[PDB]
């Protein structure tokens, strides 16, 4: 009876979507949905709100539903395309654009989109059918140029001098030379491949370590961290909880700067794998696109090879466990399980290694279908179980943007840390890094902000169907 009250929340959710308050935009579109669940618009918007929050799964859900309650909701078809795109589902997205270019024959763009998705669908599949480095020569062939005025690997070693030089180089655009980049990649892969899936570090009674979350190519923020918290070293260790690339337009600077420090302080500088240190994700969000623009489409092939040798989780003093995503779908899972995972490869569509990089904590109890469409969500009980069954106090993960840079959930058992401030030059969130001390493994949150960067918009690489999706 209240179709007036139903649409009172169709502007009190359709409003906070303007103030980039998608968490409330969603929480109100829902209440509006609950009252009147037959309005395609409500679903269409709640879908976009899910897109802006990276909840691709749910975004696909609302989109589909919006399309059932109205086959004339062009918005719905687009919103659903984007959802599929994000999950990487090529054809599934093409079929939607196809259905649009028809109901709107004289609709420009609609063709730009169909022809665009098409190109990709053909290619993606076009690529089918051994070690990449076994090929390129490097130290051998690889020459250099006297015209090259930037950082050279002092005897292909990596020095504190090279790092600082390299960083200044990067602060001013300018790419490191291929020969050095390849050398860094080959060495880091060597070093990474010799690490167990579950790195285990022991923090002395005194002596801290710093934990950072998603970085996402936000290079000039990586530098803000190093200035604000000190450069990496044996006396000032660091650990970056995955997601160093994609979305940000300086993933190549960020990544080579991290691998660089990985080589300089391989026992005090830790990198864990994230859902985005994956080929599937790299080819939709910019890294592949960026690596090919700045180097060769073969440099990228080597990146994804080292990305597979990145540990999946790290445990500090047997008390704190940190991984990019979260806990698991299945209830078994133990610290030993993790160690014995065959990391070197792309991730399974489900299972441990998958949850380890994609799961999100949940307020309520028990698992649930992930808003993302992959892995699952988990309740405080699941966190407590795991914690207990492994003699772990709490977990530190990233994987999700957070207004205040971090978030403590599940009574303090699940901690989220995010290191990309103003996420995509649009969220406007603070970011944080954690100080973990041996004598007191209590998370010490440190917030940092904005900090300016050269032009170049987020996702300046990668086909345009995405850049046009995220904004
Ligand atoms: Mn992530
Ligand atoms: Mn992320």
UniProtKB/Swiss-Prot annotation:
Required for autoinhibition, as annotated region: 467-471
Q: How is its activity regulated?
A: Autoinhibited. In the autoinhibited state, the TPR domain interacts with the catalytic region and prevents substrate access to the catalytic pocket. Allosterically activated by various polyunsaturated fatty acids, free long-chain fatty-acids and long-chain fatty acyl-CoA esters, arachidonic acid being the most effective activator. HSP90A and probably RAC1, GNA12 and GNA13 can also release the autoinhibition by the TPR repeat. Activation by RAC1, GNA12 and GNA13 is synergistic with the one produced by fatty acids binding. Inhibited by okadaic acid.
Supply the alphabetized keyword list: Acetylation, Alzheimer disease, Amyloid, Amyloidosis, Cell membrane, Cytoplasm, DNA damage, DNA repair, Hydrolase, Lipid-binding, Magnesium, Manganese, Membrane, Metal-binding, Neurodegeneration, Nucleus, Protein phosphatase, Repeat, TPR repeat
Recorded GO molecular functions are: ADP binding; ATP binding; G-protein alpha-subunit binding; Hsp70 protein binding; Hsp90 protein binding; identical protein binding; lipid binding; metal ion binding
Q: What PROSITE patterns does the database record attribute to this sequence?
A: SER_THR_PHOSPHATASE (PS00125), TPR (PS50005), TPR_REGION (PS50293)
Q: May I have one GO cellular component term?
A: intracellular membrane-bounded organelle
List of residues binding substrate: 216, 247, 275-276, 372, 399
Against Gene3D superfamilies, the record matches this protein to:
3.60.21.10, Tetratricopeptide repeat domain
Record text on subunit structure and interactions: Probably forms a complex composed of chaperones HSP90 and HSP70, co-chaperones STIP1/HOP, CDC37, PPP5C, PTGES3/p23, TSC1 and client protein TSC2. Probably forms a complex composed of chaperones HSP90 and HSP70, co-chaperones CDC37, PPP5C, TSC1 and client protein TSC2, CDK4, AKT, RAF1 and NR3C1; this complex does not contain co-chaperones STIP1/HOP and PTGES3/p23. Part of a complex with HSP90/HSP90AA1 and steroid receptors. Interacts (via TPR repeats) with HSP90AA1 (via TPR repeat-binding motif) or HSPA1A/HSPA1B; the interaction is direct and activates the phosphatase activity.
The name of this protein is: Serine/threonine-protein phosphatase 5
- Name the gene: PPP5C
């Amino acid at each position: 009876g209240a179709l007036k009250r139903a649409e009172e929340l169709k502007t009190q959710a359709n409003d906070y979507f303007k103030a980039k308050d998608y968490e409330n935009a969603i929480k109100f579109y829902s209440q509006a949905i609950e009252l009147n669940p037959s309005n395609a618009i409500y679903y269409g918007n709640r879908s976009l709100a899910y897109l802006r929050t990276e909840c691709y799964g749910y975004a696909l859900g609302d989109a589909t539903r919006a399309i059932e309650l109205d086959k004339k909701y062009i918005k719905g078809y687009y919103r659903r395309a984007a959802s599929n795109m994000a999950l990487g589902k090529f054809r599934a997205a093409l079929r939607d654009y196809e259905t649009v270019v028809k109901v709107k024959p004289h609709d420009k763009d609609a063709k730009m989109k169909y022809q665009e998705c098409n190109k990709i669908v053909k290619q993606k599949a076009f690529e089918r059918a051994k070690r990449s480095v076994v090929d390129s020569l490097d130290i051998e062939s690889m020459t250099i140029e006297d015209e090259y005025s930037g950082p050279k690997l002092e005897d292909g070693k990596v020095t504190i001098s090279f790092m600082k030089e390299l960083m200044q180089w990067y602060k001013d655009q300018k790419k490191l030379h291929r020969k050095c980049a390849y050398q860094i990649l080959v060495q880091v892969k060597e070093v990474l491949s010799k690490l167990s899936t579950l790195v285990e570090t022991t923090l002395k009674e005194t002596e801290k370590i710093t934990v950072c979350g998603d970085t996402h190519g936000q290079f000039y923020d990586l530098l803000n961290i190093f200035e604000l918290n000190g450069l990496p070293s044996e006396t000032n260790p660091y650990i970056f909880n995955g997601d160093f690339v994609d979305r940000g337009s300086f993933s190549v600077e960020v990544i080579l700067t991290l691998f660089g420090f990985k080589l300089l302080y391989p026992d005090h500088f830790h990198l864990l794998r994230g859902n985005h240190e994956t080929d599937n994700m790299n080819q939709i969000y910019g890294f592949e696109g960026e690596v090919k623009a700045k180097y060769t489409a073969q440099m990228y092939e080597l990146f994804s090879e080292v990305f597979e040798w990145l540990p999946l989780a790290q445990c500090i003093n047997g008390k704190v466990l940190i991984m990019h995503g979260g806990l698991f779908s299945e209830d078994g899972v133990t610290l030993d399980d993790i160690r014995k995972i065959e990391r070197n490869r792309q991730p399974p569509d489900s299972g441990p290694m998958c949850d380890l990089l994609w799961s999100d904590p949940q307020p309520q109890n028990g698992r649930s279908i992930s808003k993302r469409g992959v892995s699952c969500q988990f309740g405080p009980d699941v966190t407590k179980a795991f914690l207990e069954e492994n003699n772990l106090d709490y977990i530190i993960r990233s994987h999700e943007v957070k207004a205040e840079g971090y978030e403590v959930a599940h009574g303090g058992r699940c901690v989220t840390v995010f290191s990309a401030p103003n996420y995509c030059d649009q969220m406007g969130n603070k970011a944080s890094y954690i100080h973990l001390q041996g004598s007191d493994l209590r998370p010490q949150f440190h917030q940092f902000t904005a900090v300016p960067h050269p032009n170049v918009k987020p996702m300046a690489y990668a086909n345009t169907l995405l850049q046009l999706g995220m904004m």
